[PDB]
Amino acid sequence: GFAWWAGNARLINLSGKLLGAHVAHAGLIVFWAGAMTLFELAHFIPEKPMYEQGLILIPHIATLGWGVGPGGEVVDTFPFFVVGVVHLISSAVLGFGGVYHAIRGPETLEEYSSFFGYDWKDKNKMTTILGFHLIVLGIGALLLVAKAMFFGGLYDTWAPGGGDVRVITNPTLDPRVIFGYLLKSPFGGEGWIVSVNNLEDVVGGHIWIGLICIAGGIWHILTTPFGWARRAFIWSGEAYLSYSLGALSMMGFIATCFVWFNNTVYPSEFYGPTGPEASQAQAMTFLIRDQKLGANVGSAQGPTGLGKYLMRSPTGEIIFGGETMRFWDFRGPWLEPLRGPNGLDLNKIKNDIQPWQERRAAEYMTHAPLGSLNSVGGVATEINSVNFVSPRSWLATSHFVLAFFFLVGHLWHAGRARAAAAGFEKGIDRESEPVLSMPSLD
Amino acid sequence: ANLWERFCNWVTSTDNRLYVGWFGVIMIPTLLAATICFVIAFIAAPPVDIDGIREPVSGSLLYGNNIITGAVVPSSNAIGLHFYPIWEAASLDEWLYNGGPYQLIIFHFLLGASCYMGRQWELSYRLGMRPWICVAYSAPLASAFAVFLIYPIGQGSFSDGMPLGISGTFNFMIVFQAEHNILMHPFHQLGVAGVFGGALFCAMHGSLVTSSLIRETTETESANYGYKFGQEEETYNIVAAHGYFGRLIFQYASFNNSRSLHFFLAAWPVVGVWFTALGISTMAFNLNGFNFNHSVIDAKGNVINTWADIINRANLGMEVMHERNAHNFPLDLA
Amino acid sequence: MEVNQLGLIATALFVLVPSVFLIILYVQTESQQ
């Protein structure tokens, strides 16, 4: 009894047409991944940093070690083409199965086959489908491990000499390290799992997750939910959707912070510098300029009494001064050579800054992730000239919006699933209004 | 008869004057902590070094503020996004100087308000209501997350979160405009349409229902006494209201279905405020309002100013003066 | 702080005089029954 604007709710109990909707939609996702990659490649100019060109998919491929060499220079565009073509081609297969199952195939699957058919309220069948998909997911996490360890490695921004593709031979297996990330505070200087800063931990985490997902998949194929879980959940397709919307919302907010703060699995070479990074790079830049002119940057007192170039963090570490004092948790391969045990090392600053560090700071300061909606780069008062919005801002903002709306959708569908399960989603029975049979509050 | 199940029955009782519920078990302590700390800080907290430059800003009444100027001041820029509970300070004196109370208040408040939203779902379920009032409240709730949590996360510091005070609020608005040109951002423009439109439709609906009240009283008594709580009959004539409003404009621009009408009332401001909350939340990552600065130039290349360049002059005056001691380098990159 | 000293009596009467008006009217409403 749904209206046209809620028309996809008419599929809740049509397993065959619903399968087609899902598979056709999957074709749309893979189609966009292929079409967008080819569009990005058609526009790609190798002499410009990726992040001056509005690219978000080529950076993901480069990060896996395809197409790039030392320093992130693009050496071969063919892997990008391949990725895009194969996705694009694959979307026709998914589109074909999708429209066949949506339009021509059995409307319900329960009759054609007891294996593919399902009842939302069949807790055994639901956990079995979940188990299969967990196994698939586990395999997917192990593919990343396979790439990193046996098929060319990954791009490592921390590699000595400017960054490079590196095979991961000793992934981190120590669960104190792997699960230690899951227990770190999400606040500053800690950063929960967003602080992962080396590829050994990245790959070992995916070994763990792959194994965990396969084990849990096997578990759910073989079990039925225990009574305590039976009594805690709503068992209906809309309820299950609502659970997944909540999970996607959570994941999207996490992805947002990943791309905004992490410069390891989102190398700044490809994505541009992070906000903290660019701010630090400004202070580095003027420290360099002023020191070259003769300034003693360690002893220069600024207007407030705090150091103009250098000051202490609240726990004593020597850090950049000015407003970037807030960003002293930043860590990046161009800056760490200057760090000693007590923070920034005055003797390294005076003696060991290299031209490539000067260049990188100047580049990152002038490519900070600030810009207008019409892609005028810089602070809001800047004049037109530079066409630039950082890929990090594009990826952060988009995924914040999506994550927010999916939380709304979680609330919408979770509340509706509860009300429909108890039988009052269409309104209050005039003849049995609960409040009319309750005592008054006063 | 079991202790836990009796506790469970009291927690979820529909007979409590104020509903508690499981969300209430978290909401009540966190709102009380935020409220008590807020009241005490507003009255008596000493000055706070908001921008981390050893330049403390007095926010409380006893230190020379009135109701309009007073604020609980954001925590120090020196802290940034670091977690600063009391037990991390060497002393309360230190915690107060560095703006500790702000953190305690906003974290307890955001948790408590979140649970307030869940509590709205929860009682609707206990009462056999439909469930989505809580979805309406997600619009103001999202807006508070934006200014107290998301914007600091994006800019790297709780010192750039919204101060808990009347003039502090205006300070936050002005700085935001200089750094993000929020007025030229479509999501804020949608917020204005949501809020202006919400006020419009509030007045419209109130005046149309009020215009069509059925005569049930005399000139010597308030017409409100013509309605009795829980009566079954509607108290106004919606067909007369529609007959007036459809002629004021034209027939098909007026609702005759009260359900669609009240759904529209709900949806317009909620959706507008979602957008404006998303505006703040995405300007948190410096995707700023439209920049048409020097977009119009003449045949020779002279800039021809538009009203956008005049906005820019105002934005510049805000930019160059804000936090006038806090910048040592030429770009205010966060 | 050097506030206007008449601000106190201004505020006090601004609160007191309207409030008393309403209390007068409420209490004589109650005693009607």
């Binding site: - | 004057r17 009255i43 009444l61 009135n66 109701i67 709580f229 | 506030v3 106190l8 609160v15």
Partner: peptide, 30 residues
């Protein structure tokens, strides 16, 4: 004196909330 006045008014408002909630006129049906 101004601080006393501000906090006094605030305190009266909180007290009013108490009466308005717990000593409201009870809504009665039909």
């Amino acid at each position: 004196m101004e601080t006393i006045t501000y906090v006094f008014i605030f305190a009266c408002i909180i007290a009013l909330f108490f009466f308005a909630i717990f000593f409201r006129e009870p809504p009665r049906i039909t």
